[PDB]
Amino acid sequence: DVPLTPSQFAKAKSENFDKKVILSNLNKPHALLWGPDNQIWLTERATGKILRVNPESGSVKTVFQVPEIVNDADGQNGLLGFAFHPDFKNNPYIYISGTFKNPKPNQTIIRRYTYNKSTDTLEKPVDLLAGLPSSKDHQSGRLVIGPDQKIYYTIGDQGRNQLAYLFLPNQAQHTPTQQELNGKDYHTYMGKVLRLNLDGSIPKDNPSFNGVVSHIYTLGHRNPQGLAFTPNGKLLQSEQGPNSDDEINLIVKGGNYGWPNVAGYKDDSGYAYANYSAAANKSIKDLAQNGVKVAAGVPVTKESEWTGKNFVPPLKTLYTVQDTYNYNDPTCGEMTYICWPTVAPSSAYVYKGGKKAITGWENTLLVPSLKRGVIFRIKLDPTYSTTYDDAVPMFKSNNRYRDVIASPDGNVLYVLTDTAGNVQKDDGSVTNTLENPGSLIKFTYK
Amino acid sequence: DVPLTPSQFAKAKSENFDKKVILSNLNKPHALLWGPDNQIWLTERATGKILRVNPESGSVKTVFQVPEIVNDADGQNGLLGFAFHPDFKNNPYIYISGTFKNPKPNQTIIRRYTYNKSTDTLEKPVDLLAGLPSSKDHQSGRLVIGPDQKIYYTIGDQGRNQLAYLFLPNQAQHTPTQQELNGKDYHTYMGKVLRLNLDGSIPKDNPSFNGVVSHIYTLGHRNPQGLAFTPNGKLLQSEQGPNSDDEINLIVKGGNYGWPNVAGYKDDSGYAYANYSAAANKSIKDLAQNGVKVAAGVPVTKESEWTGKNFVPPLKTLYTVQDTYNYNDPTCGEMTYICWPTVAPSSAYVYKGGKKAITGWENTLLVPSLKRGVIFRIKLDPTYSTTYDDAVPMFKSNNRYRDVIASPDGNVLYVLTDTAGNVQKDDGSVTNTLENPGSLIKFT
Ligand SMILES: O=C(O)c1cc(C(=O)O)c2c(n1)C(=O)C(=O)c1cc(C(=O)O)[nH]c1-2
Ligand SMILES: O=C(O)c1cc(C(=O)O)c2c(n1)C(=O)C(=O)c1cc(C(=O)O)[nH]c1-2
Ligand SMILES: OC[C@H]1O[C@@H](O)[C@H](O)[C@@H](O)[C@@H]1O
Ligand SMILES: OC[C@H]1O[C@@H](O)[C@H](O)[C@@H](O)[C@@H]1O
Ligand SMILES: [Ca+2]
Ligand SMILES: [Ca+2]
Ligand SMILES: [Ca+2]
């Protein structure tokens, strides 16, 4: 899709909803879920805390704090994945993923907890999968349980080929040899959607990549922070792209989503793959022109020159631009990146309506934006096979929306906002003054 | 997708198949089917003839000639739609569409015939749907019977907003009023996928548009000459775009495929909608630069400015380019268009494999190209939800490929070629010298 203008974003205020801030100053609130007890449960990435909030009173209880969660002030690491067992009433388990120190500097671990109703706390931790890659950038970490009773987990590309990890070789396209696999060497588990048994083992029916069946379900991902099943069993996803081409994807077994060789469509438009890990020397700068313009010494491959297989294009890009696009626009001052044609999608939620469903929201996907301060509504057809029209911005504000859910009746939305960061103002200019720092906000349909 | 180069087409010779011309004297062969009798049936668009060919021997019989078929030498009209009833043994009907004079100058008519095996001919014609738009351009006309036992028919935009119909207002986005339906006025039946009952009536479960349920199933199409159901009931389609953005689409009930406001993706790249019907200068010329550059006077709408509803993007474009693209390529001397970043897909065929299935052709869609002289192989995932990778060209030749099918076994392909027309040679130049004019060719 084509980028919206600052003016089109600005007018998306959603006057049809009543806003009520339930909590503020949470410490990097990250994920929220409608609980099996009909209470709002949410995580604090920074502290490892799992909070349960009473929707009516806003009353908060710190149900549990995951011990030894490692978090960097300037990183996207910490407590990430969070889900309940689908049949909680009979299988009182909570699944999480987190950044922990790797004895063998960090690792990501997927772990199960048992919820104790009588003591109201989490207990009996079991590490399902440990030794996973870890870094300060592009961790992803969305964790869901599918209709097939498997764990689906997004693990980002770790930030390789940009910023502080500029010269590390991106592994989004790499998959394990049986040897690595036998040694539980999961270094290729970057830029992937993993599928695992509820006990952490490899599903016998997982896709085969280069002759090996591992935890990988799909590959070629950058930073997929949104993952949600539809009522008919399909898997929708949102993913952060570089300077362009954030994506909405449909996740299909064994698919290759192209990163980093391809961003968005295979269109050679507005992006090219500059592999700094192959650059002549580690002294060259990243011009930050999305590979369209690069410094001498770095090998660039067009999306059309890539030779990978099973490439699956996105359903929708936010956004795609042409080679002439200016990635250095002097409107976002020293925070140029905020003016890039992206929306920085932080999650992905399948709206399921209910007895008070919101008019016209059937088969929609809600996708919160960090840098634009809106929540997008994206319509699909009734079979969730295609999108209809464009991503509609809602709830415009000077906030970084991090996650969103709806109440069972469907007439109330609950959203989380970031504690700090940059957001685009009504006039396209950049601000780090967030209206609702680290909040739990409720939007009630009038 | 990004355009291949002359050299990339040139190299798609498919030295792994054996070519053998089965028939070569055809006059504008258009559609070909694998018949319920295990013979190959094909049509001649200009003559209205329906031929049957023995796949083994190559013996051919003219089973019937549809009477009073109208065809302009310079046109795409004639006998178009052609399908068999799915339960032929018990319902020996053949469904066609054809250009006929309109007493009330032409109209398109969807008609049924009954097959008589003892006399081996067609009879008892029944007009299912008449009074459909007709013109010399963009007729489309693919006719298929779905798993729901309904007729699905593609009807083009009639060429409006280009060439001889430049100043006519494109109706791809228009739908009928309940008053037009009641009156059997089907003028809005342009640039659509229609869905009809086997008797021509309106299916009670068809989609509703602007308040009315008509034969329209989907709208916003240019020239969709390809239509094929997959084994799991999905509807794949191919469609001719203008100077760019030919499409592979997945047809979903009530979808809007964007034409003419949007070509390919809604990306504002390489196309814009210049509405000549709205220009004040009937004097205005078409610069033929795909809306990127136009003469003064004609109103232009960007893809991103369109206020459409239910817009469904293509699965794949052949091809998409940027605004810096030059639509005036010298390599193609006089026939500049041939060098345009399109492939001109004339059909769409779902490869069903079989006992001798071509290795790795599982879940593929075959798309013949007129202007490039290839057959593209397009891979989809096993649920026919997404494409995998790109369109792989095959059988490069100086021929205009018009249709393609496979034998039940899956190891032989049958293709039709045009009698005449321009085709891109191995090195980019255009030639009107076709290697196998109007033939039925088999690739083993
Ligand atoms: O392209 C951008 O302008 C932009 C902005 C942001 C952001 O505002 O945080 C992120 C990203 N990109 C991005 O690619 C990304 O992976 C990302 C992750 C996060 C996050 O806070 O977890 N923000 C962003
Ligand atoms: O863009 C092109 O270069 C190009 C070429 C051709 C062609 O070769 O005839 C057709 C088209 N476009 C086209 O848009 C189109 O609708 C069309 C129909 C036919 C036909 O012969 O039935 N050719 C073409
Ligand atoms: O450079 C723009 C943004 O790019 C993202 O890939 C990084 O994770 C963010 O830290 C950064 O602010
Ligand atoms: O102009 C290029 C081609 O464009 C198509 O839209 C027309 O149907 C063909 O007759 C024409 O040759
Ligand atoms: Ca980004
Ligand atoms: Ca991708
Ligand atoms: Ca791209």
Ligand SMILES: [Ca+2]
């Ligand atoms: Ca064309």
Ligand SMILES: [Ca+2]
């Ligand atoms: Ca279209």
Ligand SMILES: [Ca+2]
């Ligand atoms: Ca377009």
